[PDB]
Design a protein around this ligand. Structure first.
Ligand code: NAG
Ligand code: NAG
Length: 361
């Protein structure tokens, strides 16, 4: 099984224990580690933070300890406009420029592959998104003629039924991608004035309609669309989403007035790192959606949807039972990487939990 783990560059600026560097990563934890967000400049893949080539370096040395490790640089991201991605893909010229600029870049920095994080292509981009994947992979094939191991190519893909139908020619791009990562953690959130869990596993017979909003549906659909199970990798979050309640109500559907207060370390509203969630639990009331098998806690006017060790192990058994290629953990830097925030001293509890399951039969 594969364990694709994301590391975000901007997690370096978090204060105190929040601060996270490539060197803080267990090199035997994952099978592939993806560095979060390179940019695009003058149609050429480029760096983002000032000290990226230093961190690229830090990160890639981990292979000195674990030679089986593979690293990938991911382009796009959120703070990266999809229009930009769009303007580039639609002009065979600007597109071709970008492509020819990629191999050398990764080769110079020690990466084994590129990861496309085009964040949500439109109805208009589907055709181009396909061309990009194709020609890009055609380039990676032609560049291995030089005797070096062929660079890998992957994409982080939306898990929303509408999004998939709108801008993804799945049957086509599965043939060129070494693996596809499903963003199976963005089902609630996106501003929706009722409370809810963002990464539910199952449907759960409750205040329904959103039938397609759960890893399980997302997955089945991908398979129905022609994507081979051995190329699918299911996303498992390491963060929780918060909500400032609008009333003393807590159960499903409870009214929400806006996102939650920021985490002292992550400083972004509506989101809490697993380790911050570990601290939050103290003095909180835990709950479990038995139908969807994912928990939530509450304390004061704060409601949090998150994933813990059991929920995570569960999703892990699931992908194994449907025979997928593996799991994907978003934000290794949001897990208890120091292993000193969540009690029982284990470094990277959530990711470890997943690894243990993947390591059983
Ligand atoms: C963080 C950073 O460096 N971003 C730059 C930015 O000036 C620009 O939006 C983009 C377009 O060329 O190029 C990026 O590399
Ligand atoms: C639209 C965009 O994001 N690109 C900006 C551009 O306005 C700026 O002049 C240049 C570097 O200074 O690249 C980015 O900073």
């Amino acid at each position: 099984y594969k364990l694709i783990c994301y590391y975000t560059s901007w997690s370096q600026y978090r204060e105190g224990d929040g601060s996270c560097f490539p060197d803080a990563i267990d090199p035997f934890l994952c099978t592939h580690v993806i560095y979060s967000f390179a940019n695009i400049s003058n149609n050429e893949i480029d760096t983002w933070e000032w000290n990226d080539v230093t961190l690229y370096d830090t990160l890639n040395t981990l292979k000195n300890r674990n030679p089986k490790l593979k690293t990938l640089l991911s382009v796009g991201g959120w703070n990266f406009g999809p229009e930009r991605f769009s303007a580039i893909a639609s002009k065979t010229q600007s597109r071709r420029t970008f492509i020819k600029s990629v191999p050398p870049f990764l080769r110079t920095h020690g990466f084994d592959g590129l990861d496309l994080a085009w964040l949500y292509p439109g109805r208009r981009d589907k055709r181009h998104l396909t061309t990009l994947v194709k020609e890009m992979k055609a380039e990676f094939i032609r560049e291995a003629q030089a005797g070096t191991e062929q660079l890998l190519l992957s994409a982080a893909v939306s898990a929303g039924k509408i999004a998939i139908d709108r801008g993804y020619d799945i049957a086509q791009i599965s043939r060129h991608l070494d693996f596809i990562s499903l963003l199976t953690y963005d089902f609630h959130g996106a501003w929706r004035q009722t409370v809810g869990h963002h990464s539910p596993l199952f449907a759960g017979n409750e205040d329904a309609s959103s039938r397609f909003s759960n890893a399980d549906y997302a997955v089945s659909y991908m398979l129905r669309l022609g994507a081979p199970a051995n190329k699918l990798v299911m996303g498992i979050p390491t963060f929780g989403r918060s909500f400032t309640l609008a009333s003393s109500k807590t159960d499903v559907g409870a009214p929400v007035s806006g996102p939650g207060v920021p985490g002292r370390f992550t400083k972004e509203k509506g989101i809490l790192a697993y380790y911050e969630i570990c601290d939050f639990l103290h003095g909180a009331t835990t709950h479990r959606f038995r139908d969807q098998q994912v928990p939530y806690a509450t304390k004061g006017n704060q409601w949090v949807a998150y994933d813990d060790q059991e929920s995570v192990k569960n999703k892990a058994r699931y992908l194994k039972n449907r025979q997928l290629a593996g799991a994907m953990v978003w934000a290794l830097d949001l897990d208890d990487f120091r292993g000193t925030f969540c009690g029982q001293n284990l470094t990277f509890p959530l990711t470890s939990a997943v690894k243990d399951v993947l390591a059983e039969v």
